[PDB]
Amino acid sequence: DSTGLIRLQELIMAPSRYNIRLKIRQLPIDSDDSRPLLKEMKRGREFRI
Amino acid sequence: HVIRIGGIFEYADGPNAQVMNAEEHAFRFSANIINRNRTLLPNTTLTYDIQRIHFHDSFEATKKACDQLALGVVAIFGPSQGSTTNAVQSICNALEVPHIQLRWKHHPLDNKDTFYVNLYPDYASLSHAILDLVQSLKWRSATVVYDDSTGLIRLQELIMAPSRYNIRLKIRQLPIDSDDSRPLLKEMKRGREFRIIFDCSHTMAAQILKQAMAMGMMTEYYHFIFTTLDLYALDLEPYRYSGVNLTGFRILNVDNPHVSAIVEKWSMERLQGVMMTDAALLYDAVHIVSVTYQRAPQMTVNSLQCHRHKAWRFGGRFMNFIKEAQWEGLTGRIVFNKTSGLRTDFDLDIISLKEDGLEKVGVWSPADGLNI
Amino acid sequence: IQRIHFHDSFEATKKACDQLALGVVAIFGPSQGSTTNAVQSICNALEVP
Numbered sequence: 355d356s357t358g359l360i361r362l363q364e365l366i367m368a369p370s371r372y373n374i375r376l377k378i379r380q381l382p383i384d385s386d387d388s389r390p391l392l393k394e395m396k397r398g399r400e401f402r403i
Numbered sequence: 404h405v406i407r408i409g410g411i412f413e414y415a416d417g418p419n420a421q422v423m424n425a426e427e428h429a430f431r432f433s434a435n436i437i438n439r440n441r442t443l444l445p446n447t448t449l450t451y452d453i454q455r456i457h458f459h460d461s462f463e464a465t466k467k468a469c470d471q472l473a474l475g476v477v478a479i480f481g482p483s484q485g486s487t488t489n490a491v492q493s494i495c496n497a498l499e500v501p502h503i504q505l506r507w508k509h510h511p512l513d514n515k516d517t518f519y520v521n522l523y524p525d526y527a528s529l530s531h532a533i534l535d536l537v538q539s540l541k542w543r544s545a546t547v548v549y550d551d552s553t554g555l556i557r558l559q560e561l562i563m564a565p566s567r568y569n570i571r572l573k574i575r576q577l578p579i580d581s582d583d584s585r586p587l588l589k590e591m592k593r594g595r596e597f598r599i600i601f602d603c604s605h606t607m608a609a610q611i612l613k614q615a616m617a618m619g620m621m622t623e624y625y626h627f628i629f630t631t632l633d634l635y636a637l638d639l640e641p642y643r644y645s646g647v648n649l650t651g652f653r654i655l656n657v658d659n660p661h662v663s664a665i666v667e668k669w670s671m672e673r674l675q676g677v678m679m680t681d682a683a684l685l686y687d688a689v690h691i692v693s694v695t696y697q698r699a700p701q702m703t704v705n706s707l708q709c710h711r712h713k714a715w716r717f718g719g720r721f722m723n724f725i726k727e728a729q730w731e732g733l734t735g736r737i738v739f740n741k742t743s744g745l746r747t748d749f750d751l752d753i754i755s756l757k758e759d760g761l762e763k764v765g766v767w768s769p770a771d772g773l774n775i
Numbered sequence: 776i777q778r779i780h781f782h783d784s785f786e787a788t789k790k791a792c793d794q795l796a797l798g799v800v801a802i803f804g805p806s807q808g809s810t811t812n813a814v815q816s817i818c819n820a821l822e823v824p
Contacts, residue, residue, distance in 0.1 A: 356559040360552045363574070370546075370573045378562045394566075461816035465788070486812035493784035511809075513782035 408478035410453030417457030429682035469709035499718030521745035530561035546573035549602035621645035653752035687732035
């Protein structure tokens with residue numbers, strides 16, 4: 355949820371301060387299967403999460 | 404017959420304020436049309452009770468709602484805020500009586516209710532509109548420019564959206580104690596982005612207009628879009644003939660002479676007035692409920708008590724009648740997403756300022772996407 | 776000691792002033808917003824921390 359992202363929005367203007375990239379990944383809220391998200395980041399090949 | 408409804412009006416001094424604003428006048432003027440309509444409540448006298456309230460006293464509205472509940476009214480216009488209304492629908496779900504939203508509020512993460520509609524539009528369907536055009540405009544370096552973290556709540560589906568379209572979007576909020584972009588207009592000068600959409604109230608945005616005015620940011624290179632709706636009561640024409648690329652929106656179906664008429668009729672009434680989108684939707688919200696009541700079976704709202712727990716007989720019955728109300732008004736047709744019982748039937752007049760004036764250049768719908 | 780449902784204010788509508796008609800000297804309201812939006816507004820009203 356973005357209610358947590360209210361609280362650490364100031365970590366998100368740090369890419370607006372100095373360059374660091376990011377991927378916005380929400381937990382599946384209409385379900386509980388994050389393996390679509392786990393495979394999509396497996397396609398993303400990301401290691402800093 | 405004589406019928407009565409309930410009224411709630413937030414002000415700073417609240418009831419101690421004497422300001423009939425636009426919405427307080429459009430309450431009574433919307434009643435005065437039905438008072439002159441035999442086409443709606445033909446012999447039923449439409450009366451009301453207004454309980455003007457301050458901001459965020461939950462004990463005031465605790466007393467204030469059960470006043471009109473001991474009365475018993477047939478319409479509960481919900482509060483503008485979201486904090487106190489947590490109890491109010493918790494009161495409305497308690498004694499079998501429908502409750503209405505006027506704005507966006509956050510959605511319950513523990514329960515799911517029965518007495519709820521949202522004539523206010525849908526932000527995910529707004530992100531549908533955003534992806535129809537920004538991808539069509541190929542805008543790829545932008546910045547979330549705003550002051551509302553509530554805006555960061557409601558368009559996070561558009562923050563999930565960079566997975567099929569590339570746009571480099573940054574995150575910039577105003578100094579929250581003020582309305583200042585004079586550092587920020589140097590920051591976007593150093594941000595070199597000529598294509599940005601803006602998430603704030605037109606109250607503060609008219610100041611930010613004057614901020615970009617003194618920062619000389621009024622050029623057609625700055626191909627921007629806004630998100631607000633009511634600006635014709637504010638400045639346009641130096642910003643117009645400066646030469647800019649900018650786009651506003653309008654839910655109000657200004658195609659009919661009737662829609663233009665009700666606005667122009669309204670436009671002389673309030674002192675320091677032309678139609679607001681709140682007064683337009685309040686006009687529609689008044690003119691849905693009494694249509695739903697004139698078609699309703701015999702149901703009188705019981706004098707319920709807040710020292711008791713008595714429930715009115717026809718609460719979910721008339722909530723069914725509210726969720727099946729499909730009255731079309733000045734803002735196009737109103738029908739509810741029956742997966743949620745909430746209104747997502749809204750169409751965007753894609754209106755864009757050029758030096759001649761504001762000009763509608765297309766539509767957005769959730770059945771066309773963009774249609775130019 | 777009181778108890779209410781999750782996301783329910785009509786219970787604590789009584790149960791707050793059950794402790795006020797009692798008289799309590801500290802309200803440790805829940806970690807829920809929609810509860811304490813009703814509660815601490817009135818704690819602000821009738822001089823209650």
